Design an enzyme around this catalytic site. Structure first.
Site, PDB file in Angstrom:
ATOM      1  N   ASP A  46      52.464  41.555  35.001  1.00  0.00           N
ATOM      2  CA  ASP A  46      52.837  42.107  33.864  1.00  0.00           C
ATOM      3  C   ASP A  46      54.214  42.524  34.287  1.00  0.00           C
ATOM      4  O   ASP A  46      54.613  42.965  35.489  1.00  0.00           O
ATOM      5  CB  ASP A  46      52.062  43.543  33.655  1.00  0.00           C
ATOM      6  N   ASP A  98      39.503  37.408  24.330  1.00  0.00           N
ATOM      7  CA  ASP A  98      39.067  38.383  25.023  1.00  0.00           C
ATOM      8  C   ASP A  98      37.595  38.559  24.840  1.00  0.00           C
ATOM      9  O   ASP A  98      37.166  38.542  23.714  1.00  0.00           O
ATOM     10  CB  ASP A  98      39.733  39.583  24.886  1.00  0.00           C
TER      11      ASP A  98
END
Length: 233
Positions: A122, A7
């Protein structure tokens, strides 16, 4: 395969935020040197504002390794997808927009091809045991199941789905076994729940094709080479 992940915020490698330094390229190069065949990047800067997409850094990172990179973070428009691909990205990771505007994203499959796109979902398992799709961990469910969303995109040749359970894995991995069996023509990627090497072992035989590994590598729990050795045996 194992899919090592970073990230990135403003050029900084972060653990979701702890600062792990401003050296993403040597890190990625070493992941590839250990056998990784695919890498995964989340542009957190771009996710917060697509205007600030870290295209120059992404260009440099992709140029500096010899393996395909999938990149996500604030992919909201056709123009965003095109810009990432032009920068040399192998696959663009589509998240919230894939839930928000399926007809639009179906058009992106037709333009760019299913090999260029990864749908990132998700999932929360609800009270009844339904796999509910949500656009983030801090927002409510969106009122569509994982199966319903997958089946929405199958007619345009969906091939890559990245599933994160937001409701460690060494747990009941039935979620992955279930969906992989139901859609054998899709290559599923798993994200989250990898805290140690036993968590990777837990996903073997589930039918999951790709295992995203991020923080466990940063924390020095195991290496990419060890992860691949585990995954392959």
């Amino acid at each position: 395969m194992i899919i090592p992940a970073l990230d990135l915020i403003g050029g900084t490698v972060v653990r979701v935020l702890r600062d792990y330094g401003n050296d993403p390229l040597p890190r990625l190069q070493d992941y590839a040197a250990q056998g990784a065949g695919v890498l995964h990047l989340v542009d957190l800067t771009g996710a917060k504002d697509p205007a600030k997409r870290q295209i120059p850094l992404i260009k440099t990172l992709v140029a500096g390794v010899n393996v395909p990179v999938q990149v996500g973070g604030g992919v909201r428009t056709e123009e965003d997808v095109a810009a990432l691909l032009k920068a040399g990205v192998a696959r663009v990771v589509i998240a919230s927009t894939a839930v928000k505007s399926p007809d639009v994203v179906k058009g992106w499959f037709e333009r760019f091809g299913a090999q260029a796109l990864v749908l990132a979902l998700d999932v929360r398992i609800d009270e009844h045991g339904t796999k509910q799709v949500a656009v983030s961990g801090w927002q409510e469910n969106s009122g569509v199941s994982l199966e319903q969303l997958v089946e929405t995109y199958l007619p345009v040749g969906l091939k890559h789905v990245l599933c994160t359970d937001i409701s460690t894995l060494a747990s009941n991995v039935s979620l992955y076994e279930e969906v992989c069996a139901r859609y054998p023509q899709i290559a599923f990627q798993s994200s989250g729940g990898i805290g140690d090497i036993d968590d990777i072992a837990a996903l073997r035989g589930t039918g999951v094709r790709g295992v995203i590994v991020g923080r466990a590598l940063l924390e020095g729990k195991f290496t990419v080479k060890e992860a691949i050795q585990c995954w392959q045996n």
